[PDB]
Each structure stands twice: as structure tokens, then as C-alpha cells.
Design a protein around this nucleic acid. Structure first.
Ligand code: ZN
Ligand code: ZN
Ligand code: ZN
Ligand code: ZN
Ligand code: ZN
Lengths: 199, 524, 52, 197, 237, 199, 99
RNA sequence: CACCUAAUUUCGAAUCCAGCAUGAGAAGCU
């Protein structure tokens, strides 16, 4: 195509936020201090997996609408290549038109990440049976990401905004059942030609 | 032709070169003496590892550092046991703060050239025929039968004992002609209480701590507490023990016939982190602790049943070192008596008394001739023709392979000589076709299964069992899921169909499996 | 081939037809548009020498 | 004659993943990780760089309206007349722009980590699949040198445009998940070919 | 070293310790033959004994005594493994080829013969070609064109030699040779000509190749005597 | 004449080295497993052509300098015999004084030779449109070659070293555009006698 | 001086290979030709019979052999071909061994 | 402070080229 769509998304966290650290060496370093370390970059900035959240959100709402969409959440489930989520976020042969960036925190982890603690409490005698120290993100932390749609269709930005609204309602990241991850999105969308860096 | 670099003098050393194609056996630790030994070894083509004890396995990544080994070969079970042993050995060298011999990159680069193979499967590599057999020291223990052109060498590496519970009590044997034998004398003087462990554990339960080696002995004691009834729980500390116990469970097919569900039962509860070891140290409920991080458990305790080499007790019945008699029985279990029995691996007194008792067995013993494997034609070659400046003859006969003589014999010789589940080949073919269309057996599955079948029959059995094993924690097979409107009962039935079809395929030979699997995987 | 198959198995006991002018014309056409190439015509010749 | 040297210095903004390619380095590492990062034998990270530049330049020059060959299709033949044919090679000529590999300035023990990624069911929100992958950390510095043999007045501009398209899209694998977003710094100079005499 | 005993030759060499059959005291590596007691009384049990049919029954006893027994150009195997075990004999059902060289006799399979048959086929086909054994210019123009392409080394003495050999094979073989030599390669852009020496561009080089083609085409229509008198001046052999 | 120059070069590999297999039967044996076999000896060590690389480097630089150097790269081009590289590497009437050995690895096969996978990706789809497998030489592999200059001159070692630095800059063999074959050289030279063997 | 007779034949040690001629500017293979070569590790035998010998003949022959190791034997010596290693077994005989 | 998981699938091919050029002589014994 001659045009591409840029969606600059901006996340502001209304709820606390948690996404666990993926890296084994950083987990082994942090486990002496914190049992639940947040996902962090090497530049002390918070990484959040964005793709896979948009894909799951669009999978639930496009399945509940009744369109012939596949479910990539099952064990070794292969994307069929024939629905709109397969065209958007990828299939086995054809890749994703929407290259979805990680949510880069605008602030350092020394300013936006706090170590917290939680208790498992026995129900009859009402004392903290277990005390364990986790790590979360403060409210109002700003996460900017860029979604690049290479072969844009008419209903691409509408599906992205619908998945974003579903992510606002249902949360993003971990600990979504106990109240972590309710956020708000700001969207700045534009159409740019691919040859915008030539000459 | 054979050089005893490491194992000639001491007990902990081993480095046996066989310069046919240079073939190295059992390079291990016991810094410049190690460097001199490695320089004396030189550039070796094949490095063979019998068993995973550093004693006979330590100096393999250093050889990869100095670029002296082209191919490493060894059973799967001792290949991963060697990994495990290399990684701890490395963190033992980093915690003690002494310069190491090799890095973790050397560990990783040592495992790219390592081609595991199971027992009783022969390679024709470098004009040698290398075969592995079992000798019951640990799970991946192999005696190496090297069929050279100038002899037939049998390197028996640390033969086991009749007081073993996980391994076959008679060690396996080369079924042909043996020329030179390389033996051990670790327990070459000391001769000869498995129920006494049960008896003292009964009369003690204050909980009893019992230490051992993390490799070998801990799993034998785990079995001896498993096969009989013990109400008080048995517990694993020292996380080498739990990891080798899990390797024992995954590599179950490399054990006794009676052991081939679980192996060690669910009686043991391992301890993972150090905080549970601290809580177990402060605990007063009676139990059995089998450690190998012993001091946390010991300073509270201070029976301390002490099994090993060194109410403090000593049970000298859980040693995998071979007694004199069963070494003599190993020698008298060969089809032909060997020409020379080289007695490496022991102290001087045990070497002298075993030399005296094999001299009394009238067999020659060295304390560190020509054999010509000839090819006999036996064919009338007077009727010969010239076609393309070649004196060829169209030939019809039989390659007879007897000992010392691969005689070629005609058809008149044949005239004088004349005076596991099992499914059919069409059922196997239609099953593999149906599971290939519904993508359960894929091309990657067939290629990995062909690699595991080239490894050996039991390696393929282990691979297919792990691919078909349902996890009690997730209910996932590790199979590939089908394609279509298939319910869960039918998906389980086709998983069982794939397991039975591939086991049947394991039953077949190494050629009809190849003739089946190129119809679905052209590469393998 | 017949004698070798016969005795090699006796010791183991323990097509479309289109015209020649159209063949030449079609190989020429596919050679001009590079479906059939000198690597393909050589490899197919090697497998033709190995049998039918 | 003259030669054009473009020393590129690459700082890694998001995680990076280029999969290993050697069979003996993958099958010896599948017992430890599922997606090993592409490496040297000196424990440094390798990234293919010429193909990313070529793919970038073919996308932007194809959508600009100029005639360029598409070497993306299977068993494609370069035309030999277009701009990317002159720069990155064709069938009958060779690339003027020899593009080195992206060699990391650090080892793997400094800038390679071993992450745990999942796959989560949609109805029940449970971790259905788990796999492990080696990724390059953020801020890892890579260096490469583009050497152009017969330079023109529009080779450095096209190389810089391809680099900006790479920072917009990503280099390496897992590009749609956010992996491989990078930042480029260019030091361009025009050397003489007889300078070593 | 050769000792004696009660008829026993005990020849010691550097390789092995033979004993042709009182018993000795050293190692008897090869023994050549109640005798079991004569075996059992002898220290360092022999490697392989060298033993009318009762022998074989005796050899079975020697087999049971755990002692190897033998009953009375280098050859190499380029074979497979396969294998089998029938009637206590490890076998191989293979038919092949006995190749006799000066020092080695090797046993090769039918695949090697197919290799050899492909080479011999490709050798035979390139012996008999077509009918072994036009433009026009004047004779003097042929002279100055061959002189001009000789000076700039387009037509060289080797090209004149192969031209004369293909002309002796007939008209059509020489036509095939010049159409092969002047064949412009569609995927490469070169012909099988020596490039001229001198500061030239592509147009005059292509024109000179065209006059080389036309000169060697028009020389073919002449007889053999004129062609011989035309080419001796340039290629004396 | 009375002396000859010995130039022992020890070259280590910095980016992966490919040099293609030349032997047609060795190729036809190896194309069942690897589409691009590496050049190899019968003793399982890697061969690299070395004389052509040094010669081509010297012609390229001495042509860019403006010196009288013929090119022996055009189609059936013949050397004049009056150049500076014509003396070192030969002409039609005279042989080269600098006999240049093949670059032979100090290690062997299956220790520095590694077989790898290469790709060709669709630009519009981002899928592996093609795949091949090529055999490379690892980085840090050490190769040893000798250059015997029969009639030494004052500028032979400087020319050989300059061509070696050009081989460092361009690559020695194989896919040099993609980044393969970037090497570095260590030079040890001595003026040995011609009659050193005459004891 | 005898000829260097190989121990193996042409199917074992002789291998046809591809040599090139590459343009220096466009870096494309301008020419291409096939040439046979004898592989590495192939062994050859020869016999040098010196009649009326002297004391220094063997030292001269061995010095020439180490020079052939230094330069090469056969053709294409400048491109790296023909580098060899020689083993020498000498012996004194009389001429009437056959008598 | 724990605990489960760490797998799986596709591709692994295609093409160009394989030519020129030089030298075919002279000595002694006889
Ligand atoms: Zn789909
Ligand atoms: Zn052991
Ligand atoms: Zn031991
Ligand atoms: Zn193009
Ligand atoms: Zn010149």
C-alpha cells in the first residue's frame, strides 16, 4: 500500500498496575527483595505486553458479535488467516498488519514503581497467615505506544478503539481480578504515506 | 595402540586414548598437571563418556576449550546428568572463588557436538564399530565395545553391584569376540543390610537425617524407602537430589525391566527453597531427611545414618562399586576370555590382589601381539572382464561376518549351510496418514521422532511417552492439537491412537520406519 | 536391471504419451520462459540415468 | 576512486529478538530455551542487516511509484536496472553497498536475557501455553559499517531513509509484538580506495 | 628364541608367542595341536588355538572351554550394514562387484557401477557427432580479415587449429563450431571469442565479432586446398 | 635470488565465513543436507582461495591510485607483464614471485563448520517466502597461510599488508555484501635464505 | 627418479572442481572453468635409485624434498596448490640382491 | 511466602556460467 495508519495511544492508570517480569535473571535478582517484580526494561522503564491484549479483546467481542473469528487462546491454536483479527494481528502465513508496540513508560522506575505487600488472611481467626511483598505501578503513570497499520482498511481504527475500550473496562496486565489495571486511553490517529523518509 | 593417560595410577583420574582414528574415553578431573594431561591427549576425534560422575566426566568442556574434540558421544541419561554435574561443578568453583578451568560458554559449546546414543546400538564411525552396554553404576552407565580393525576392546567403566535396586544386576555383555578388556579395582579387596536401613528408620521414628552422594546413592535410598511401607514421610533436601530424582523419573526406560504411574511412588516430598529447609530444621514431627545443604538439618540433629565412603551408623551395603567376585563373574561371562586385562582404577593393594586372582584365573593382566581382521574373498576371480579400465566381476554371494574374519561366501556355501503393541503395516500407514492430515503427527514430530529412533529404541519410547504424558497439573499432552469439529473424547482417542501407532513403529526395524516416514517427511 | 533385481531379491530370501514434436516445442517454450532450466534439465537427466 | 563508509551505531529501544539460525546451536539449546537469540561463537549478538535495508527500500521505492523489482516473492529475480538492484545487488552484478552484520559491543552475559512468554485463553483467562525466549536488553549497542564501492549522490540518503523506516517498523523478529524497535546514529565519510598504500 | 620340549617348538618372535605341540613357563599366545589337561596345565590361557572331522567336535569343546579356535592383495568393503542372524551366522544378503586394482581388491555395490555406466555413456556419446567426414567474400578480403583478427588476437592459432579440425570433419561440423563460438549468451552477454587487444568500445567489438563470423563462414564454402593455403600462413602446424 | 620472503599470515574470523564448495561430487553429496556447502578439504578442514583476493585488492587500489596496473578480472583478460601486481602474481610469460597458499583452518570440520538457515521474506506480507540452508565458518576460527616471495623487493611486504587490510575491509570470500567473511589478519614475515635446506 | 605413483585411483582422490575469474568492479564471475585436482591427504609413492652413490647424495635429495614442501609440486603453485609432505625411507643395497 | 507451565507448526528451495591463450624445439655422443 501507499498509506499507513499511525495510532499513538497513551495510557493513564486510574487503578494500580502490575505486569510481572519475564526475564529469569532479573527475577532471580529481584526475588531476594520482591516476590512479584514488575516488568522493567534495562533503561529502568516499565514494559507492558500490548499485543495479545488487543487480540484477546477483539477475539471476545468479535466472537460475542457472531463473526467467524478464530480463538488463538487455546493450546497451540493456529490462526486461520480468514478473519479480521487474523488480518489485524497476524496469522501463520500472513503477518500482522498492525505492528503493535510495547507500552513504554514515560517515567523512570524510580519514580513510578513502588514495592508493596499483600497478605493471605485466615478467615476464622482473622490474622495474616502469609505476608508477601509485591511491586506495582502508581496511579496516573503514562504509557505511550505506537500502532502501525501497514495496509489500512476502513474498520481498522474502529476495531483498535473498541479493543482499547474493552481493555479500559477489563484491565490490562496481571491481577485484573483483584483490581489491578483499570486504565484510560487517549488516541491520536493519522494517515502517513510510506515514502515519508525519502529525500 | 592404547594410552592410559589419566586412569593408570590414581582412582579419581581417567583418560583412555585408543589410536586406531583417535578415540578418547572418560576424560575427567581427579592446574598445570591437568593441562599436561590434556596436551598429552592431543586432538581426539571421538570422546566417549561411560558415566556422568565427574570422576570420569569432568575434563570434557576444557577439551572443547582447547579445541581437541571433534565429536562427543554418550547415552542421553548421562548426557543430561553431565549437564547437571557441569553446572553445579561450575557454581562450586564460583562460590569457592578459585580460578575455574572452563566457563559456561564452554559448557554450552560442549553440548553442540554431543551425540547421545543408547545401549546395544552400534555406530560405524571412523572405521570403528562403537557399541554401548550397561554396567549398573548409574542410570546412564555404559561399557564401550570398540570393534577396531586391529582388535576388539571392551572398556568396562565402573561396573555396578548386585546390591543395586534401580539397575540390572547382571551387567550387559558384548555378544561377540572380546580381545582386550579394561577393568576396575575400586573395591578390588573389600568384599560384600538393606533391611537394616528399614529397621533403624523404624526404631528411630526424633527425625533421622541421612546424608549421601547427590548422584547415585540418594536414589537407591529413595527406592529402599519406597518399595516397602513406611508411614513417616521421606523428604529431599540438597536440590541436586530432587533434580537427579526427576531425571531418574523422566529417564525411567533406562532402568530395570521390573521398573518400567510413578517410580519412586509419591511417598517423598522434596524441599525446594532454603526457607522450607530452615522450617524443616526447626520442625519436630518425625520424618526421614535424605540430604546430600546438610548442615541446616544437622546442627539441629546433633541418628545421622552415614551411608557412603567417609547413634552414628554405617551401612556398607549401598555402594555401587564392584566387588571382586562380580568382577570375576563379569570376566567369566565373556564368550571368549580376553587376551589382556588392563587393571586401571584402584589403589596399589587392590590392583595387586586382583592381579593375583586373575593370574590364578590364568588370564594375562597388565598394571599400567597382532590381531588382523582380514577380509577373505573365497571367490573364483579368474573369470574377470574389462569395461571402463576396471577389472570388475558381477558378484552374487553373502557377506558372512564371523569373528576375526569377514569372509565373503558364495551361494554354494549357502547351499551347504542349508543342509509393545503390534499393529499391521497398513494400519500404521493409515493411522499416520490420518494424523498427518489432522496435523497431530506433523513433519517436525516425525523428524524429531526419527532422530530419537536413530538414537535407539528406548530413547524413542521415552520421547513418545513424554509427548503423550498427560500432566496432572494442566491436562496438556504436549501433542499437537487436531483440526476440525472434534470433541474432547475423540481428541483423547486420537492422542491414544498416535501413541499406539508410534510405539508400534518403535517395534519395527530401522529401515521400514525410514520407508514409512519419507512418505510424510522427505527429509527424515 | 532385470537380472540385478531378480538375483538381488532371490538372495533377500533369508505414463502420458504426447508427440515428440510437441515434447521438443514445449521444452523449448518452457526453456525460453525459464520454467525448465539447465539445472533442471541436468538434474532430471541424472534421475533419468538412475532409472524410470 | 572513492568509497563511502557509513558507520551505524544502533541503540536498542525495546526488546530485540533475532532467532538463531545454526542447527547445532538450536538443537543443543532446546533443552534450555525455546527461542535462542542469534549469536556469534565469540558470544556476541548477530543481526542480519542487508535484508532489512533492502526490504525497507523496496517497500518505500515501490510505493513511491518508481520501478523497483520485488525480491520478496518466492524465487524472485532482480531486474538489474532499479535502484535497489544497483545498491544491494542483482543477478549478474553485485551490491555496491556491502552491509556488515550488526555486531553487539557487549557479550551475551551483559545484554542477553532469558524471558518467559505465555499464551492465554480468552474465555477463562488462564496461561494456556508457556515458552522461553532469549531477548536482547534495551540500550544494547550494536555497530555496523556500510561500505559503498562506487558511490553516487543518492546512496547515503536512501540508506538513511531505510534506517528511519527500520526505526519506525523494527529490525529482527517478533516485530508486531513490539520487539525490535531501535534507534540509529550515522557517521558518514568518503574515503579513498588507495588509502591503505 | 626357540626352545624345545617333549614331542614342542616354542618360537618367540617380536609379534606373538607361538607354540607348536612338558609345557613351558611363559605366555603361549598361539598354541597348535586329555589335551584339555594339557591346555589347563599351561599358564596364560592361549588367545587362539590352531587345530578328521572329530577336530570340529573337539573344537566345540574348545568353544565350550572359552577359547577361540581356528580350523584350517588386500580386500576392502564399501558395503552397507543391514545384517541378520541365521543359523548362528551373522549375514548380509548382498550382490555386488569385485574390482581388481594393482594393490587393492574392493567390493562395490551396483550404485558404483551405475556411476561408471553414466560416465561411460557420457564418454561414448561425445565421440560420434552428426556427419563427421553460406556467405561469400573474395579470397583477398578473407586474407586481410584473418590478418587483422590475428594482429588483434581475436582469431588465434588455437582457434585456427580447431577450425581446421572441424573443417576436416566436414562442412556441417564446422558450421556447428562457428555457430557455437559466435553464440551470444542471452543470460551472460559473452561469446566464445578471444577479446581483441586495443582501446575499443562495445559497438566496434561486436562488429569485429560479426566480421569474424562472416569471414569464418565464407571460408567454409572454399575447398580444402585454399583453406590450407589460407591457414598455414598463420598456423604453420 | 639468494633470499626469499616468508609471510606467515594468521587470520581470525569476526563475522561468519562462507566460501563455497568447488568439487562437483562433494557438492552433489552435500546438497541432500546443505544447499550451500562450505569449501573443505578431504581432511575435513576449510579451504579459502587467497591469491585472487590479494591480487584483486592490489589491482583495485593501484588502479584507484593511478598506477599502471592491468586488470585480470574482465573476461579472458590477459596480464601485460609490466605492472606491479603483474610481478607479484604473475603474467603470461612470467610466473608470480609470490606463491600464495590456501587459507587452511587450524581447527577442523565439525568444530568450526556450522550449518545454518537463511531466509527470503515477502515485503507486503512478512512471511518466509523462501528458505535455504548454508554452511558457514564460526567467528574466532583461526586460519593459517604462507606467502613465499621468491625474488623479494622493498615494496612487496607493504603491498601484501595493504591487500590484507583491504581484505579486512571488504571480506575474504563468499557473501560479502550481506556481511559474511569479515576477518582480521596477523602478519609475521622474515627474509629466509634460499639455501637454508642445504645443510 | 621414478614417477610419483598414487596409491588410490581417480574415483577416490581426483575431484573435478570449479574455478572462477571475477571482475574487480562489478564483483561478478566473468569466467568459469572446471578443473580436476587431487585431494588433500592423498598419498603417492616413488623410488629414487642412485647408482654409484656418494656420501652427500641423500642430503641433497632430502634438501630438495623439503624445498618441494616449501614451494609445491605440480601446477598452479602460486594459487596454493601442490603443497606436500614427504617421508623418506632410505637403504643401502648391493646390486646382486637378485643374483 | 508459595505453586502450575515452559511447549508447538510451516519452509529448508531456485538460477547463470564452465571459456580462452601461449609455446611443438635443440643438442651431443655418435
Ligand atoms: Zn483467524
Ligand atoms: Zn560413576
Ligand atoms: Zn568412579
Ligand atoms: Zn531491481
Ligand atoms: Zn599487467
Amino acid at each position: 500500500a501507499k498509506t499507513m495508519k499511525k495510532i499513538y495511544v497513551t495510557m493513564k492508570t486510574l487503578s494500580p498496575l502490575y505486569t510481572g517480569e519475564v526475564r529469569r535473571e532479573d527475577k532471580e535478582a529481584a526475588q531476594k527483595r520482591v516476590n512479584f517484580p514488575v516488568r522493567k526494561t534495562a533503561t529502568n522503564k516499565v514494559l507492558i505486553p500490548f499485543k495479545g491484549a488487543l487480540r484477546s479483546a477483539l477475539e471476545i467481542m468479535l466472537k460475542a458479535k457472531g463473526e467467524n473469528v478464530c480463538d488463538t487462546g487455546e493450546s497451540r491454536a493456529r490462526p486461520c488467516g480468514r478473519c479480521v483479527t487474523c488480518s489485524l494481528f497476524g496469522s501463520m502465513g500472513r503477518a500482522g498488519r498492525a505492528s503493535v508496540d510495547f507500552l513504554i513508560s514515560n517515567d523512570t522506575k524510580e519514580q513510578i514503581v513502588r514495592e508493596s505487600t499483600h497478605l493471605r488472611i485466615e478467615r476464622q481467626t482473622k490474622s495474616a497467615s502469609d505476608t508477601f511483598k509485591g511491586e506495582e505501578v502508581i496511579e496516573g503513570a503514562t504509557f505511550t505506544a505506537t500502532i502501525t497499520i501497514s495496509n489500512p482498511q476502513e474498520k481498522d481504527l474502529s476495531l483498535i478503539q473498541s479493543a482499547l475500550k474493552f481493555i479500559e473496562e477489563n484491565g490490562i496486565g496481571g491481577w485484573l481480578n483483584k483490581g489491578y489495571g483499570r486504565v484510560s486511553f487517549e488516541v491520536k490517529s493519522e494517515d502517513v504515506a510510506t515514502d515519508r523518509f525519502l529525500k | 595402540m592404547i594410552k592410559f593417560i589419566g586412569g593408570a595410577s590414581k582412582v579419581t583420574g581417567s583418560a583412555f586414548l585408543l589410536e586406531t582414528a583417535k578415540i578418547l574415553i572418560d576424560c575427567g578431573i581427579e592446574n598445570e598437571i591437568i593441562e599436561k594431561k590434556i596436551n598429552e591427549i592431543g586432538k581426539a576425534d571421538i570422546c566417549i563418556l561411560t558415566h556422568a560422575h565427574l570422576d570420569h566426566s569432568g575434563l570434557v568442556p576444557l577439551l572443547v576449550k582447547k579445541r581437541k574434540v571433534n565429536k562427543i558421544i554418550s547415552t542421553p541419561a548421562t548426557k543430561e546428568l553431565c549437564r547437571l554435574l557441569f553446572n553445579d561443578f561450575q557454581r562450586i568453583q564460583e562460590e569457592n572463588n578459585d580460578i575455574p578451568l572452563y566457563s559456561y560458554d564452554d559448557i554450552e559449546s560442549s553440548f553442540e557436538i554431543w551425540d547421545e546414543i543408547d545401549d546395544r546400538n552400534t555406530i560405524e564411525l571412523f572405521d570403528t564399530k562403537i557399541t554401548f552396554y550397561n554396567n549398573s553404576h548409574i542410570i546412564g552407565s555404559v561399557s564401550v565395545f570398540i570393534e577396531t580393525h586391529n582388535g576388539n576392546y571392551l572398556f568396562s567403566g565402573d561396573i555396578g553391584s548386585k546390591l543395586q535396586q534401580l539397575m540390572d544386576y547382571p551387567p550387559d555383555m558384548p555378544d561377540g569376540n572380546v580381545d582386550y578388556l579394561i577393568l576396575e579395582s575400586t573395591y578390588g579387596n573389600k568384599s560384600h543390610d538393606r533391611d537394616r536401613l528399614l529397621e533403624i528408620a523404624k526404631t528411630t521414628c526424633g527425625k533421622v537425617l541421612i546424608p549421601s552422594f547427590a548422584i547415585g546413592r540418594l536414589q537407591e535410598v529413595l527406592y529402599t524407602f519406597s518399595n516397602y511401607n513406611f508411614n513417616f514421610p521421606v523428604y529431599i533436601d540438597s536440590p541436586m537430589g530432587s533434580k537427579v530424582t526427576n531425571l531418574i523419573k523422566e529417564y525411567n526406560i533406562y532402568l530395570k525391566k521390573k521398573l518400567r504411574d510413578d517410580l519412586f511412588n509419591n511417598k517423598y516430598i522434596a524441599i525446594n527453597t532454603s526457607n522450607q529447609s530452615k522450617e524443616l530444621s526447626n520442625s519436630k514431627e518425625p520424618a526421614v531427611i535424605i540430604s546430600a545443604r546438610i548442615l541446616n538439618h544437622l546442627e539441629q540433629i546433633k541418628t545421622l545414618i552415614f551411608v557412603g565412603y567417609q547413634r552414628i551408623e554405617k551401612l556398607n551395603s549401598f555402594s555401587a562399586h564392584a566387588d571382586q567376585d562380580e568382577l570375576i563373574d563379569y570376566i567369566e561371562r565373556l564368550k571368549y576370555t580376553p587376551y589382556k586385562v588392563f587393571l586401571v582404577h584402584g589403589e596399589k593393594e587392590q590392583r595387586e590382589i586382583l592381579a593375583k586372582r586373575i593370574i590364578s584365573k590364568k588370564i594375562r593382566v597388565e598394571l599400567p601381539i597382532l590381531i588382523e581382521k582380514k577380509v577373505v574373498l573365497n571367490i573364483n576371480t579368474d573369470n574377470m572382464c574389462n569395461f571402463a579400465s576396471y577389472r570388475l566381476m558381477p558378484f552374487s554371494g553373502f557377506i558372512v561376518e564371523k569373528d576375526d574374519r569377514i569372509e565373503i561366501n558364495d551361494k554354494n556355501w549357502f547351499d551347504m549351510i542349508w543342509n509393545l503393541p503390534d499393529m499391521s503395516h497398513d494400519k500404521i500407514i493409515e493411522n499416520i496418514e490420518y494424523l498427518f492430515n489432522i496435523k497431530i503427527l506433523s513433519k517436525n514430530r516425525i523428524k524429531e521422532f526419527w532422530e530419537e529412533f536413530c538414537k535407539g529404541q528406548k530413547a524413542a519410547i521415552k520421547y513418545i511417552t513424554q509427548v503423550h504424558r498427560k500432566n496432572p497439573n494442566t491436562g496438556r499432552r504436549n501433542w499437537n492439537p487436531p483440526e476440525g469439529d472434534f470433541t474432547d473424547n475423540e481428541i483423547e482417542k486420537l492422542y491414544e491412537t498416535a501413541y499406539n501407532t508410534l510405539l508400534s513403529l518403535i517395534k519395527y526395524d530401522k529401515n521400514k520406519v525410514y520407508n514409512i516416514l519419507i512418505n510424510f517427511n522427505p527429509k527424515l | 536391471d532385470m537380472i540385478w533385481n531378480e538375483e538381488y531379491n532371490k538372495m533377500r530370501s533369508q505414463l502420458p504419451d504426447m508427440s515428440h514434436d510437441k515434447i521438443i516445442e514445449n521444452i523449448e517454450y518452457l526453456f525460453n520462459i525459464k520454467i525448465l532450466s539447465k539445472n533442471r534439465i541436468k538434474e532430471f537427466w541424472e534421475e533419468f540415468c538412475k532409472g524410470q
